[PDB]
Design a protein around this motif. Structure first.
Motif, mmCIF file in Angstrom:
data_model
loop_
_atom_site.group_PDB
_atom_site.id
_atom_site.type_symbol
_atom_site.label_atom_id
_atom_site.label_comp_id
_atom_site.label_asym_id
_atom_site.label_seq_id
_atom_site.Cartn_x
_atom_site.Cartn_y
_atom_site.Cartn_z
ATOM 1 N N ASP A 21 0.948 -1.194 0.143
ATOM 2 C CA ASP A 21 -0.088 0.068 0.030
ATOM 3 C C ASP A 21 0.902 1.348 -0.086
ATOM 4 O O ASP A 21 1.828 1.149 0.636
ATOM 5 C CB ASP A 21 -0.975 0.203 1.325
ATOM 6 N N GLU A 23 0.130 5.411 -0.131
ATOM 7 C CA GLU A 23 -0.716 6.725 -0.127
ATOM 8 C C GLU A 23 0.268 7.969 -0.152
ATOM 9 O O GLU A 23 0.823 8.299 1.063
ATOM 10 C CB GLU A 23 -1.607 6.531 1.110
ATOM 11 N N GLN B 40 -3.508 4.539 7.615
ATOM 12 C CA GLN B 40 -4.290 5.404 6.561
ATOM 13 C C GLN B 40 -4.993 6.370 7.261
ATOM 14 O O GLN B 40 -5.704 6.024 8.366
ATOM 15 C CB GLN B 40 -5.232 4.493 5.639
#
Lengths: 50, 52
Positions: A21, A23, B40
């Motif tokens: 992942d 971001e 996140q």
């Protein structure tokens, strides 16, 4: 020394991990890996580097 | 053959509905059953849910 010092099977000396992942925020970039040391392959964390 | 088939009349409300808010405290409460610790900004392990 001959025995018990080095294997003879198939082992990657150095392997590259691609992030799972990633971001890209406004002013930071977070990338998460899942480094998976195999079986009977003791890994020293000093050798890792992004 | 009209909108009665696929459209439903309802009372207008200025609130435009009431979504749920989810409260997550990330580093205090242990994560619930099927949540994993993702740092996140979006995803955090929820701890409770309420209407706004």
């Amino acid at each position: 020394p001959t025995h018990d010092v080095t294997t003879d099977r198939s082992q990657r000396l150095t392997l590259r991990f691609v992030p799972v992942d990633r971001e890209a925020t406004t002013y930071l970039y977070k990338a998460r890996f899942t480094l998976a040391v195999g079986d009977n392959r003791v890994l020293d964390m000093a050798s890792t580097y992004f | 053959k009209g909108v009665q088939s696929w459209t439903l009349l309802t009372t207008p409300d200025v609130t435009c509905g009431a979504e749920q808010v989810y409260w997550s405290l990330p580093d205090l409460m242990q994560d619930p059953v099927t949540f994993r610790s993702t740092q996140q900004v979006s995803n955090y392990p929820v701890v409770g849910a309420e209407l706004m």
